Every structure is written in structure tokens, then in C-alpha cells.
Design a protein around this motif. Structure first.
Motif: not given
Length: 141
Positions: A8-13, A90-98, A136-138
Motif C-alpha cells: 500500500p502507499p503511505g508511510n509510518y511517519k 505482512l502489510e499488503r495492498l488488497e483489491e487495489n485499495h485497502y 482496512f483503511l488507515p
């Protein structure tokens, strides 16, 4: 190598809220180690800080209590006071969005972090690719 590597895009800042669309709950880690979901945005145990141990590998930690999200040998999520192998996700993108979170420890079993419509956490074996409960959506705190 049991899973894809779309990240997924985004970071942990900054800390985040992990919003589950299945029932519209925020992932919550209670002081007593209990894990569940709540729709109350003002809750003080839904603020989570994620951090990367390796690319795509993260710890999910309660900023309020310092506990780490973990899944035990029987698939139940719990708050751990210290980081152990059950705390790696394991953090992954799913359904091109979540965002989805698969237990690294039990990666071959496809155990995900997941919330039911009633706000209760799903036990590892009851989760699987394709469910709404694992999506999930952060969101900013």
C-alpha cells in the motif's frame, strides 16, 4: 513465500486509525490485552503506531498502552507487552485499495487481522482472502 507483494502507499511517519469497512469499526487494543473494534472515534485505544521491521513487515502498536497487536497459536488476537514473532504482520495492498495484515508467523495458514460486522475480532482460521472483514483503511488520528 506464501503471499503476493503488492504494497500500500503511505508511510509510518504518523500514528493511524485502522478502519474496517465490514462493520465500520476501528481496531482497538484494550489495556487488558483484549482486542476488538469500536465505532467511537474518540476512543483512546484505537490510535495505533505502525513501523516497518523489513519492507512490508510491520508492528502494529497501541500508542496509548504500548502493547503490540499479536495473534496467538490458536488464532486469537491479543495485545503483547513485548515484541515477539506473533507480533509481525505482512502489510499488503488488497483489491487495489485497502490494507490487509497477514500473520507472518502463520503466513502459510493465511491468518489475517479481521473484524466482524458486530465489532468482534475474527479468529485466524476463520479469516481468508476475499472477505470484507480483512480489509482496512488507515486513517489519520
Amino acid at each position: 513465500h506464501h503471499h503476493h507483494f503488492n504494497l500500500p502507499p503511505g508511510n509510518y511517519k504518523k500514528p493511524k486509525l485502522l478502519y474496517c469497512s465490514n462493520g465500520g469499526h476501528f481496531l482497538r487494543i484494550l489495556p487488558d490485552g483484549t482486542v476488538d473494534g469500536t465505532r467511537d472515534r474518540s476512543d483512546q485505544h484505537i490510535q495505533l503506531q505502525l513501523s516497518a521491521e523489513s519492507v512490508g513487515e510491520v508492528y502494529i502498536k497501541s500508542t496509548e498502552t504500548g502493547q503490540y497487536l499479536a495473534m496467538d497459536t490458536d488464532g486469537l488476537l491479543y495485545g503483547s507487552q513485548t515484541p515477539n514473532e506473533e507480533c509481525l504482520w505482512l502489510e499488503r495492498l488488497e483489491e487495489n485499495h485497502y490494507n490487509t495484515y497477514i500473520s507472518k508467523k502463520h503466513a502459510e495458514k493465511n491468518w489475517f487481522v479481521g473484524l466482524k460486522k458486530n465489532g468482534s475480532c475474527k479468529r485466524g482460521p476463520r479469516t481468508h482472502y476475499g472477505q470484507k472483514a480483512i480489509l482496512f483503511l488507515p486513517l489519520p488520528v
